[PDB]
Amino acid sequence: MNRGALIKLVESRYVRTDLPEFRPGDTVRVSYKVKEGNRTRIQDFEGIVIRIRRNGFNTTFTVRKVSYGVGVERIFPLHSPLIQKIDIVQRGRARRAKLYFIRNLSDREIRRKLRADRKRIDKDRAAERAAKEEVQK
Amino acid sequence: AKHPVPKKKTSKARRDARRSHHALTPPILVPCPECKAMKPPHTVCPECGYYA
């Protein structure tokens, strides 16, 4: 009994593992399963991650973007059965945990305020190609 | 004064009755092991002391 959490934590097996690490201040592209009419598709969604609300399992993250003149944000359960995959697209300088502030900034300022984390990229592409070697041979 | 005020002098009966729960109770005491005197449990007291 003296593990009230670990018990409630046992129900965690609905947990993912495939998904790649990413943190606010860099843009991604989730592929969500959706019910159109009655069937099932795979709608993409690509924008900057503005918030990650950590809480072990059932942690969440929210991405925003501009669709046809209007802004739009979506909240995704991190370990959701509907996220087929989540291709990251570009890393960038955080400097802050929650970046709501870009809401009032959607313009040239964003691009210049969130440069590009050459560090988290230099490790991305490095351990990408450099790690491809070990698996192939 | 302003607005409410007693409608009648309280009787010496009712008065003392109210006070039925005012009485005190003696302090809880125990004979301290070291000395002979009394101490309030869980406390150190003069003319005595403690072990380490």
Binding site: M1, A5, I7, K8, V10, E11, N58, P77, S80, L82 | -
Partner: protein, 204 residues
């Protein structure tokens, strides 16, 4: 009519097919039946389930005399489940197949001495145009010379919370016998670690 004692372990949410579901986890540990109410001896029918392992320390009480006549490991708690007589042994989560619905009972969180606005969810006066000393007050409480008194059970501020609260028709979302666990539809009275009894619903 089933029955079983447990603790509110906490709650989170799991996914049923392509839909998320909020669930409260209840540990309905194995309950050693302790006595039996019968029409002949007691005047009614029921079963006194025990629950949770007691150290023979606090059992200094002649409770041991009750546990002896049943040959049971001393428990920390025990309440009856009315009109439910299981075979002589022990009840467990096994009686709850998923999709069944249950009536859960628990002692709500204690909101202490609560104002009328929190307790009875009154309206209270204006934050603004005058008054400024009755913002959270209940205002009038009566009439005039007639009836010239206040109604019995009038809504007024006071202690509120930490009372016997029974929710109903909660869905048994799952059941993990390997852990005496029991998943529900989330909203169950009381705080975590709180004792809580789960019964069969009265929908049907």
């Amino acid at each position: 009519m089933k029955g079983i004692l447990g603790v509110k372990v906490g709650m989170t949410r799991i996914f049923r097919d392509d839909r998320a579901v909020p669930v409260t986890v209840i540990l309905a540990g194995p309950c050693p039946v302790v006595q039996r109410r019968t029409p002949e001896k007691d005047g009614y029918t029921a079963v006194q389930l025990g629950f949770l392992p007691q150290n023979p320390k606090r059992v200094n009480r002649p409770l041991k005399g009750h546990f002896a006549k049943a040959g049971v490991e001393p428990v920390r708690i025990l309440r009856e489940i009315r009109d439910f007589n299981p075979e002589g042994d022990t009840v467990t989560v096994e009686i709850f197949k998923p999709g069944e619905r249950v009536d859960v009972t628990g002692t709500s969180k204690g909101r202490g001495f609560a104002g009328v606005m929190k307790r009875w969810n009154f309206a209270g006066g204006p934050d603004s145009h005058g008054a400024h000393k009755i913002h959270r007050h209940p205002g009038s409480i009566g009439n005039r010379k007639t009836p010239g008194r206040v109604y019995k059970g009038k809504k007024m501020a006071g202690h509120y919370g930490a009372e016997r609260v029974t929710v109903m028709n909660l869905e048994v979302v799952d059941v993990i016998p390997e852990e005496n666990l029991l998943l529900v539809k989330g909203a169950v009275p009381g705080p975590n670690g709180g004792l809580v009894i789960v019964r069969e619903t009265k929908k049907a």
